Amino acid sequence: IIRSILDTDLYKFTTGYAYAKLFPRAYGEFRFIDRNRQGFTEEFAELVRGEIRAMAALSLTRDEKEFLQRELPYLPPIYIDFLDGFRFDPEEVTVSIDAQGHLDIRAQGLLYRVTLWETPILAVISELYYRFIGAEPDWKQVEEVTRSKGELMREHRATFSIFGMRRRFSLEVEDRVTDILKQYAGESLFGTSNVHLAHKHGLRVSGTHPHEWIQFHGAIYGYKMANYVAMEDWINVYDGDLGTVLTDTYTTDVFMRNFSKKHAMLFTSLRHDSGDPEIFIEKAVRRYEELRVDPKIKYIIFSDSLTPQRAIEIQKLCAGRIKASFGIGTNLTNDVGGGVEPLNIVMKLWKCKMTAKDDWHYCVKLSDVDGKHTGEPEEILLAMNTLGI
Template identity: 50%
Template structure:
């Protein structure tokens, strides 16, 4: 089902490069989290196992390597040579099915295992429909391009910048490809690119992404919760020297992040990404933070990327217009708007083993308490260390 090493989100590649540079001996463990309590059909795990085993044959082509060289000059030749020699090791993925319950665990060197999350989720999502004989009606199939066109033309009329972030929970690769094609064809300047590197290359658009929660989660395990945000940002700057300058805010709540996002980082980074909690509250807090630091919010950008719909985007634009720069990353609403229910699932890093240390649980303290992930004892410890009251988190 997967045909290219680049059928992955761009921030997995940028983080892999950073991990190789900063933490080459770190180990990581990831787990599938079935938030929607989906019941998997008999044999699902076996089919997924076969697809994962096939991924061992994927290699970066010469054409793909040249594309990265030209498009991403901040990825140095040593990393691109590494990626050209990289292949997935299916033994790093343990898949078990008990009745209708599916367990997927990934374990191994962080610089290798970091690439599994997104393609595995894409496989699980596509197989979820295939093995349950869920098909797109002819009417819905015929409307894929039209629905995409209607959305991007609305955003274009509003003068917004929109990126596509929908690899994980897409209905299928074929639908995803058609959606990106329609966005490129009808979006004009409103369409800024896609997180999927293969489709960015195929359609001649920009690959979009910087880093994810796991970058900060690992720093929490390695350096402690108090230092996690500031050192994660510092190490990112060390690797990319001003490129890829959007900072993710909500690994240990945005309130804690802004305590570390001092004038140095606020000036160095082009902006921040919102991924949980009320977007209007977040925008107000971000604007106030920049103003306290004497920085014009209009010189910075918020990337909104949390379960966006056209209605939600319009509400955010109304609030942010002429107050702060804004752009939007839209995922499932683009790539799985075909008349079926999208899956509710994630794959998250759950443990890390920094060099010279034992395995430690890693956690995420979302701006929405129901989305906290990780070991409950470690979550409680982090709340105490970070002075987060029960009422606020």
């Protein structure tokens, strides 16, 4: 199923290099979570193991290497050499059906290595799943609705990027959808998170640092300084490039309260990924003004389960206050008609350590939605108490 080593999200490489540079001895364990608790059989698990083993044959091609050098210059030559000689190691991954009959998958090993498993594994599970249940896309609808969406975004000049790899119906569907959008969205299409398809269709790659980056810092450095040190380390790695920051890892209120003038001035944008967008806009604009930073020159990239229409609505809310762009996912890569619905799956960093000899530290995420928290319950409580939540 996975044919290219570049068939993954941009953030996997940018965060991967950040780990390789600053935390080359760190270890991490990623855990697959089917939030719908669907029942899975051992034969499906075996299909997954086969795909995971197949990935060991992937290797960077000469054209892909040249593409990385030309289009992703923020990735230094040393990292390109690493990717050029990189080979997925299947034994870092363990697949099984748990006691409750649920699909369980864990990738454990050096963090800079295992972080690369996330997107490919989720995309593989998603594609394998639809094949398994015999679902097929209604290409007529794919062609039609994608064109309509593209024309709509173009008409409203809604800058957007394609962020739907992890839950795509299939590589084929994401590939064609990207092709259609490129053809009808005009300048509204900023780019795609899928590095492989950006290469194939001549588009810009698009993405931001992920939650795992902040979460790693929270587990190692503690909750009070998590956001701050994560941003300082990101700057050390990219010197100002990739200047977008996620604010809801430990709640946006905590982020804003500790957002320094230096970082507010240096980063060009914030990313909204949970909670009500209108409420997020108010908090952002208010904090920027408190810091005497002009919100009008800043951008907010909205990416919380968006639809083209919802993007247009948020766009109105931002008019005259702060700039806006969008990250649209599953609505584009998994809308094949026939009642087919996207899987509700994720694979998150569950725990980590600074070096082999360090103890394991659980990672948590709070988000801006009350009650919606992820991670070891005991650790979640500690984070809330530590942050005064």
